[PDB]
């Protein structure tokens, strides 16, 4: 029983970046795959654990997801997400979503109650709220 | 972009991937995280893949080519993540990384750029963490 | 849902694909018709594909690259992965459909696992085939 | 080997006792005229892109099969059209999701692959993208 995660590819350079700011990164990485680690332990479904780290890289603001998404040229937030059961198949996504705080719960919310594999903005927000996920404005992202 | 793969106690693989683009994203462009085999595939029968970086990534379903080089290839794990990230994407100007989890618990963070946020374990061992190369 | 494959002179494969979704569709969903690799692949080293079927399956079994990537990779040929997507794989996931294929030696197959399937191909300088019902 | 074309204008239950040989001859005369102009093209030495391209375009234009006009309706009697090209040379590809106010998504969808650094655009950033390139705005009733 395994897990992996990843908060962004790209140009870091050690110059530029202090210990203690590496260490942030470090530190949050780090505590996300420990909770994921335990949930596996305790037998949670493989689903359940991608899910939670997801949604966790997302609440943390050092990662381009949830709190701390980057902008847009027309400075607003439009986030992805997507999710994959290996067991049944199934996989759910939304695309350009502003009003849910936790996209990749969207996700898996298309996914298991919805016909449908990928959903588009206020498309996939209406289908969201319409199960009782909580709206929220785009400031919460930045 | 952010991601997570993961192989649970019964043996079912999962992938889920988040993020808010490109910075200074056209609006209304899809990147490859919303799209199934781009930024994202699980099969418990193969892989898990969750992918970081998005034209050529669209175009070359990094997620769900690791799973067919593999399940028709006969490629293992690290064979199709050095495939796919080290010679494919770098090939087609492509810069970014995955992380992979197949059946059998063996686990690939390949990436091309100078680093990748990332992290690691088996359950009830100690977690292995990353930001550049090695 | 409406595609074309094509090989020309120069040995250049394409495919396209162009849809109106299924019937009384929820607004702001995606079928597999506009996803490279669902609806629509193409290759000059393997095949040109355009799929036509019920979406959640085609998205979740990428049937339009799984054709080139079991001939590119599995050596497959053209007939064999289309009996393998279209008449194995797509109903064990719950999918009906069918797609259209040309790889690079110009084989062409039209593959489908519903009553019908409203298809024609032919050859430059050749008569056409046309097809509704299957046989 | 030889230069060739296929097309598809949808799949699924079609019933012979539902027919008449006339209302099958309408579907086989549309699928024939558009297959020959493919043909007619391809034999002319045109490139397999611009085949496939006036093949959807002509599918599209065609209301017996769902795509541009004669699409299905939406459960709000709206048309939402996608569509898809990609070149087996270059492995460019475009697409357009979820557009209404386009006559010709698979027109938009090569656009999207030959004026744009971007794969796939979707409702009004695909149209805003297509119509400051010269493409016309339409009505989604024209596909009624
Ligand atoms: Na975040
Ligand atoms: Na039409």
Do not use: E, K, T
């Given at each position: 029983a395994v897990i992996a995660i990843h908060g962004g590819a790209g140009a870091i350079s050690?110059?530029?970046?202090?210990l203690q700011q590496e260490l942030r990164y470090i530190e949050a990485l780090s505590a996300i795959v420990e909770t994921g680690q335990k949930m596996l332990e305790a037998g949670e479904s493989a689903l359940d654990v991608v899910t939670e780290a997801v949604r966790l890289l997302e609440e943390?603001?050092?990662?381009?997801?949830?709190?701390?998404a980057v902008f847009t040229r027309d400075e607003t937030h439009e986030l992805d997400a997507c999710v994959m059961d290996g067991n049944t198949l199934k996989a759910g996504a939304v695309a350009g979503?502003?009003?849910?705080?936790?996209p990749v719960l969207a996700a898996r919310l298309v996914m298991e109650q919805?016909?449908?594999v990928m959903m588009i903005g206020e498309g996939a927000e209406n289908f969201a709220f319409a199960r009782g996920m909580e709206r929220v404005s785009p400031e919460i992202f930045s | 972009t952010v991601g997570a793969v993961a192989l649970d106690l019964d043996g079912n693989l999962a992938a889920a991937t988040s993020t808010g683009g490109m910075t200074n994203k056209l609006p209304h462009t899809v990147g490859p995280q919303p799209l199934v085999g781009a930024g994202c595939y699980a099969n418990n029968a193969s892989v898990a893949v969750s992918c970081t970086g998005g034209e050529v990534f669209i175009r070359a379903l990094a997620a769900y080519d690791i799973a067919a080089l593999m399940d028709?290839?006969?490629?293992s794990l690290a064979e199709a993540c050095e495939r796919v990230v080290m010679e494919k994407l770098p090939a087609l100007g492509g810069s970014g990384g995955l992380i992979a989890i197949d059946h059998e618990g063996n686990v690939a963070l390949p990436f091309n750029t100078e680093g990748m946020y990332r992290a690691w374990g088996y359950a009830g061992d100690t977690p292995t963490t990353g930001i550049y190369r090695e």
């Open positions: 050690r110059a530029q970046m202090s943390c603001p050092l990662f381009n997801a949830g709190i701390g979503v502003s009003h849910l705080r936790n919805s016909p449908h | 028709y290839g006969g490629l």
